[PDB]
Amino acid sequence: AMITGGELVVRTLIKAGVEHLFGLHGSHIDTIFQACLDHDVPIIDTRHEAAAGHAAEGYARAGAKLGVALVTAGGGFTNAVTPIANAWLDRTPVLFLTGSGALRDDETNTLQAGIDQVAMAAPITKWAHRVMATEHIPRLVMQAIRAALSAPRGPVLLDLPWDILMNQIDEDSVIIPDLVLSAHGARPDPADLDQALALLRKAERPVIVLGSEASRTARKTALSAFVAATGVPVFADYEGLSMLSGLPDAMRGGLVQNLYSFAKADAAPDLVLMLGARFGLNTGHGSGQLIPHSAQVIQVDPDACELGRLQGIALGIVADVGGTIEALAQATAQDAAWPDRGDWCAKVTDLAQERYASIAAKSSSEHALHPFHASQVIAKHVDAGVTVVADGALTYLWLSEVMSRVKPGGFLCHGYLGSMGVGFGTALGAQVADLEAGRRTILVTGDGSVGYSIGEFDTLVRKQLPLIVIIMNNQSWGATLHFQQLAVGPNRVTGTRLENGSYHGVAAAFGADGYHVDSVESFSAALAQALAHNRPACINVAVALDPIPPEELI
Amino acid sequence: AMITGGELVVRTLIKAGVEHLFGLHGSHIDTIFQACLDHDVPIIDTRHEAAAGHAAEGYARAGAKLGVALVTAGGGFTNAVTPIANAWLDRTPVLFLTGSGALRDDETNTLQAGIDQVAMAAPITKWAHRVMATEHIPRLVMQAIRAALSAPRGPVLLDLPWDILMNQIDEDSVIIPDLVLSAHGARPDPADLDQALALLRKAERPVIVLGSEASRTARKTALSAFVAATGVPVFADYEGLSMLSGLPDAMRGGLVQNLYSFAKADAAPDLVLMLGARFGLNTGHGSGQLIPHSAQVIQVDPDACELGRLQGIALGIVADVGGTIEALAQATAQDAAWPDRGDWCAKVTDLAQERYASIAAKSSSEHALHPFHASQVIAKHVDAGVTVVADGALTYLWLSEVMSRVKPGGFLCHGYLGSMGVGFGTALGAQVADLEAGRRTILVTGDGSVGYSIGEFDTLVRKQLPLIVIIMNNQSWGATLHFQQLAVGPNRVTGTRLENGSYHGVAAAFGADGYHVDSVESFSAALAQALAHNRPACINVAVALDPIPPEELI
Amino acid sequence: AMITGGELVVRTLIKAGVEHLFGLHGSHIDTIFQACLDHDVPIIDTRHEAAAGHAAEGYARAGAKLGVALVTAGGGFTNAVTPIANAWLDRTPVLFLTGSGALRDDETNTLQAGIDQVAMAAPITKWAHRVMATEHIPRLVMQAIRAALSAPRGPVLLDLPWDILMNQIDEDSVIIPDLVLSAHGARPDPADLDQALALLRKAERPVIVLGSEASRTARKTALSAFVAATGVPVFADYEGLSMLSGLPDAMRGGLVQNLYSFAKADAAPDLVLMLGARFGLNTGHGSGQLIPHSAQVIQVDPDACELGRLQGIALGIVADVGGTIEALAQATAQDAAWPDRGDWCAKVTDLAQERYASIAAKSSSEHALHPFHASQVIAKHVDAGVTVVADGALTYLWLSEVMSRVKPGGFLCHGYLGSMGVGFGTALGAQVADLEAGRRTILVTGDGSVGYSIGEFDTLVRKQLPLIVIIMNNQSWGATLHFQQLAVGPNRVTGTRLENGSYHGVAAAFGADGYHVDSVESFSAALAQALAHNRPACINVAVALDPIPPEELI
Numbered sequence A, B, C: 001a002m003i004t005g006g007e008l009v010v011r012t013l014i015k016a017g018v019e020h021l022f023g024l025h026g027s028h029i030d031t032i033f034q035a036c037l038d039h040d041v042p043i044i045d046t047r048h049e050a051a052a053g054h055a056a057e058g059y060a061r062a063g064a065k066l067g068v069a070l071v072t073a074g075g076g077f078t079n080a081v082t083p084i085a086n087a088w089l090d091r092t093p094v095l096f097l098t099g100s101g102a103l104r105d106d107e108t109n110t111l112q113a114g115i116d117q118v119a120m121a122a123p124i125t126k127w128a129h130r131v132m133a134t135e136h137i138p139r140l141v142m143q144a145i146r147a148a149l150s151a152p153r154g155p156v157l158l159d160l161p162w163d164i165l166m167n168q169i170d171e172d173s174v175i176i177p178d179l180v181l182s183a184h185g186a187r188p189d190p191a192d193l194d195q196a197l198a199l200l201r202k203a204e205r206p207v208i209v210l211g212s213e214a215s216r217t218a219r220k221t222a223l224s225a226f227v228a229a230t231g232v233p234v235f236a237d238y239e240g241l242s243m244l245s246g247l248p249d250a251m252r253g254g255l256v257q258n259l260y261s262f263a264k265a266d267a268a269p270d271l272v273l274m275l276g277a278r279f280g281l282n283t284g285h286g287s288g289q290l291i292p293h294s295a296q297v298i299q300v301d302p303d304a305c306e307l308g309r310l311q312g313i314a315l316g317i318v319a320d321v322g323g324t325i326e327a328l329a330q331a332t333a334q335d336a337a338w339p340d341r342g343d344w345c346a347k348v349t350d351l352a353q354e355r356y357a358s359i360a361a362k363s364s365s366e367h368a369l370h371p372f373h374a375s376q377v378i379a380k381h382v383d384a385g386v387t388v389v390a391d392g393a394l395t396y397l398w399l400s401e402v403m404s405r406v407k408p409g410g411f412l413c414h415g416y417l418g419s420m421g422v423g424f425g426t427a428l429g430a431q432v433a434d435l436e437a438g439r440r441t442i443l444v445t446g447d448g449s450v451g452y453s454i455g456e457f458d459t460l461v462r463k464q465l466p467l468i469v470i471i472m473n474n475q476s477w478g479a480t481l482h483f484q485q486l487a488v489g490p491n492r493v494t495g496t497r498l499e500n501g502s503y504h505g506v507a508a509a510f511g512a513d514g515y516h517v518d519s520v521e522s523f524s525a526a527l528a529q530a531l532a533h534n535r536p537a538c539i540n541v542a543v544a545l546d547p548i549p550p551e552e553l554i
């Protein structure tokens, strides 16, 4: 009859439909550990709260569902800050449950109390709030969850004082509410939908560009019905990429990064339909080399701030990307008489094919194994059954170069935050999600980036998570080392040389299979063996440093 | 050639379609003032920055558009804080432009530099930001507008460093963007709309409650259509009242407070459609006193946090209220199978009118003018051409008891901030935008409340503003004095008596028409008089302090 | 045995030895009004929270002590923000007690509850905190007072949830701490002090300048002794001026502002002892206009950031300004051989006098009363027995030129916030402090500035506070009309016309003495009268607007 506040937290999460938590133990949050123990709710405990946070993100991104991070007071929270800020810029839905000092003995210079965690999380969350009463728990947890899931998606900080968590209340007294929130999003007004549809019908070279908000709602089947009736090519930023994985092969434009050299071939797009993709790092900023200044733009985004923020656009809609896609598939259904778009699809296909073949031709692997070739080795293993997690600068923009012509189940790369090393936690969490859906996760990170959360090879072994960490090891902080040469001068490389350490040796110590390879065939075989067993694996890949990825030259 | 920084602000402001500004001069923001002079943009300078801010609220609330406040650095910003906070809770679209310390001479103990205005506004604005370059002025102003205008509506702070406002850049060299925002709001997915309408037709005692967002979109025409086909009674909070004035009297429940008396007749609502109406102060929180616990709630709100925050709901939709009404009215043109809804309208009408007569039965005027009698002198004077601004606690609680059966063009009362003294600023700015149409504005304020921004008669006189101020005088801070008596005891009154000044004299010293009143007819002559004229009118009214409103009880 | 939290607040305030509170009533803080009324502790209830806030500062500033401000939740707090912001920059000790939403019913959209008040006050307070338990009140109240009273003095916000105040505890169980905090500030290291005196002895034309922190510790006899033994000329800024009032007039250098000419009189100070004076708006900024580069500087300040913030200095001491003056006095009391500065002092006295008369010779009042003439009339009513509070920009820039070489009991003015209208609240609270002091308070304010808190005439009459409200009336915003001519064009003035309202009529309408005067004959008669009458009085003074006050030369 008497239950702890920590019980209420878990019961509300049970009701909300959560089946996994990612975290690190603390006395302050043990009531939640105890309650999860009782209801068989697995907490995937890590070796760093940053890894736990990133794992909640990874789980959310690869699962298209809610992520839950569980951290303790003080350092527990501060260690989760990078995942918080990363989820913020990436529009990913994570509930960050955090402990704090007890309200009784507030301002007593005590263990793990003393820092305004709500004030700290404020600038980088949709909502950050501290619970003031134990009976408020179910309603406030449910409130926090609604905030995170609705467009635009984002992180929420729920601060649960040790006080409030240890408190015992009569269970029959406080009501645990249901998650009452519509799964379908808000659609555009039929007038703007009639307009956007009209504007794209009379169009010589139209393109769709998908963003993160497309993957959250993940309304794939509707995207098919819409793309089939209209026959319009679809591009995406890294986060939208996997949404193209189910499109008929002809209208798969790939990553928006290659809407770039459309300038030399007349191919400057006529009308661009942006669906949750923002103006910034991912779409060539305002520099307009990706989204051409002379194109008419139709932008759909949950936040009006994003509506033509860097370039003057034509039609500015504010609705949910998911509902918007649904509204487009619904209208496009009976309107089944659409213009001839055979030879714009071929152009988009052929221009991306060009840039690809062009780089393959300039890629030599004599004396040193080329990053491009090691990228093609992973690429040959990429279908809907595989999630790919990208980390590590030079690593990921070489990886980006092969990623457009395969159909990944998921693809989790860096957002605007671009925090080197977020990939390990992300991939761990993604592997937990992919286990339910019968899929495999592969992290592709740099030698420098992996050392951020290298202790997570332990967690992979302890929890038996079959993640294959692939390390592009060019003995350095790659992209930065290039900046020191290309931007400063040839012999001005300081603090970027990382010429020490056997990474497979580290993985071997934590009990995970370590491979160090240095050639195409050996790496190809190592990866094949890694996939072949259901066990965590490190593949230390000795790779070339000197070559320059095309993205860097821009 | 060269144009100033503030010169850019004003140009970007007119392309937005705004026609007025409310402010106070600062030598930090004269750059705006001068650019405004030669575009014939009227800056209505008040006598207190607080007043200007509330006037920006009024303007935006009265004419359902965007309001603009324009304050000087340091002290100018901090004086606008209450307006900003009020706007935040009331969900009203206002663009607060503030000057600040020049980036040159930053951190130098300078004149009006050295305070973090953005940090101060961030907890109470949808967006708070400081412009770093002069060329950024247009894209960020237009951005701030987009933020202020989308659902849910709310205030935005744009900090313009005096530095940035003075720097001249080539007039051709930076584009001045159009405001591209769909105006038509996003609407619920049809499946939810079906779920809603199916439950609505199933209901035996259905009800609709309107909140601020209905008034911000002001789709009176679509609402009427929807209300007609279905024949469901409609209620509202103070902010959603204007939106009942254009509907058939048969389906007009009035203010939500009237839903209180219903449980005493086994006539408690069966199902309630909350359109932008939040669970909180105005809807009786989660007590189940207005919105019954046994009733099945459908809630439509732009903020997912609001979806069942204090009470379990049956269906929760995140979509724009204005778009939702549009959809509900549209789904209506093909239904044509709705119940008579006449005998429930009978019940709703009977209960409302019954409550009204019940107060008239209790109210005596034999020794002092009953606030309710004095309130009626205003009621038979209220139509679609009057805008009523309510301030003062005891004043507005009594004044509401009549407002349900009359129908104003504008009704602006307190929100959650409950800030006594906002009424004058709100009223002043309501007169503009009542000058915009042909409507005339009446303010009904308490004797203590008016002292807050009493120096605004100087503005009313200077700027030829026909506003009538009805000072409800009970010689005290009424409701607070009632608190002291009812909550602690009869002889426990302190700091709540106000038995001194001649307010109607005060206004006359500023050169405005000042009146007096003892009883019912005494006031009619003063009211019909000053209303017959077309200029600033200050009326004083001696009124009984003793009587407790029905809203006070409970 | 059972007492409320509000009672705990009051008993703690009493034990700290506070005698007055300044505020505006709300039901959220009534428990504090009830306790105060029980212990005979006056709450000066005003007509605006800003006036209550400012009165708390004025009390603190005029009486060299703590000022306590009492405001209610929501609107009450937001209205006190400008005072908080002002006390911040002016380094004035004010405890701001605010009510807020109850902790039970957090996040309920309830009345006056939903603004993060601590987050708002955070940028502009030494400390801002929200009480979480009723038992914590005494220790937290006392903690706040320590924070405010210690160098550098500043404002503090204690947020007191309605919940926590209404709550009842066994009075026997909670202890009420003493205010144990030393009255003596920390003095410099002897090696630092000796090298300061080693420089002062071995220097040719040395000068002392005082700041805010010098009035906060208000050490007259120690400073008096130090200046007697050393014979060094002493200046000060606006807040420091009142400390010169007790020195030998041969040392009284007046306002450091007079120090411009030393640059072009060849006698620029060869050494400057900055005692709390800050490198900013008060002291020629960073440029050597008031503080020459050629001068070697010894600076004392509680804040190390201030130590040569914008200039190079020879010695930087973090210590209490009052404690230092004591170390200066004590050590210098043995040194019986301080070099004579009679020659240097004579030069200084005669340069301040040369400045004075050169202003006096012109400025003829042959048509209108040159504000200099209006200021000199006030001057012959100024001595140790009078506190002069000052407002209005164009107003004060004349008054400063006459204040130098007449000795006020207190001289309160604008700090770095420079907010117009702060003067009324300030004088209202100062008068309270001056009434126990036996002094008389005169407020000299501009015509626009007075409109801010014009209802406070009701306060002056209700509370019977015989403040004299002088209005220097030039029917305009003066300095901001000035700027519009001088920096734009003589025909480019908009939004500064205040040619309206007999300000003296409104004050008379609130039941105080009302006078309008124009010439020295009419004026010094209205003044002489309003003085002899021990009652609140308003002296409206029609004045020339055209004349430039000399402090503007660049």
Ligand SMILES: Cc1ncc(C[n+]2csc(CCOP(=O)(O)OP(=O)(O)O)c2C)c(N)n1
Pocket: A391, A392, A393, A394, A395, A396, A418, A419, A420, A421, A445, A446, A447, A448, A449, A450, A472, A474, A476, A477, A478, A479, A480, A481
């Ligand atoms: C957390 C973090 N630290 C530092 C940086 C700056 N940075 C950008 S690229 C880069 C080099 C990454 O090198 P590596 O992980 O080895 O991958 P590589 O480029 O060699 O393929 C660094 C340190 C960053 N973006 N994030």
Ligand SMILES: Cc1ncc(C[n+]2csc(CCOP(=O)(O)OP(=O)(O)O)c2C)c(N)n1
Pocket: B391, B392, B393, B394, B395, B396, B418, B419, B420, B421, B445, B446, B447, B448, B449, B450, B472, B474, B476, B477, B478, B479, B480, C024, C025, C026, C027, C072, C074, C075, C076, C079
């Ligand atoms: C800014 C602000 N200050 C104080 C309060 C507390 N308060 C609530 S009601 C009230 C009385 C208002 O009196 P008046 O304006 O004369 O109207 P009346 O109640 O007498 O009709 C006060 C001071 C508040 N709600 N907001």
Ligand SMILES: Cc1ncc(C[n+]2csc(CCOP(=O)(O)OP(=O)(O)O)c2C)c(N)n1
Pocket: B024, B025, B026, B027, B049, B072, B075, B076, B079, C391, C392, C393, C394, C395, C396, C418, C419, C420, C445, C446, C447, C448, C449, C450, C472, C474, C476, C477, C478, C479, C480
């Ligand atoms: C809150 C605020 N509003 C406006 C200003 C800008 N300002 C500087 S001087 C000035 C003139 C005010 O002087 P006034 O009260 O009219 O008396 P005067 O200077 O003419 O003698 C104004 C409005 C400010 N600093 N702070």
Ligand SMILES: [Mg+2]
Pocket: A392, A446, A447, A448, A449, A472, A473, A474, A475, A476, A477, A478
């Ligand atoms: Mg590397």
Ligand SMILES: [Mg+2]
Pocket: B392, B446, B447, B448, B449, B472, B473, B474, B475, B476, B477, B478
């Ligand atoms: Mg009243």
Ligand SMILES: [Mg+2]
Pocket: C392, C394, C446, C447, C448, C449, C472, C473, C474, C475, C476, C477, C478
């Ligand atoms: Mg003036």
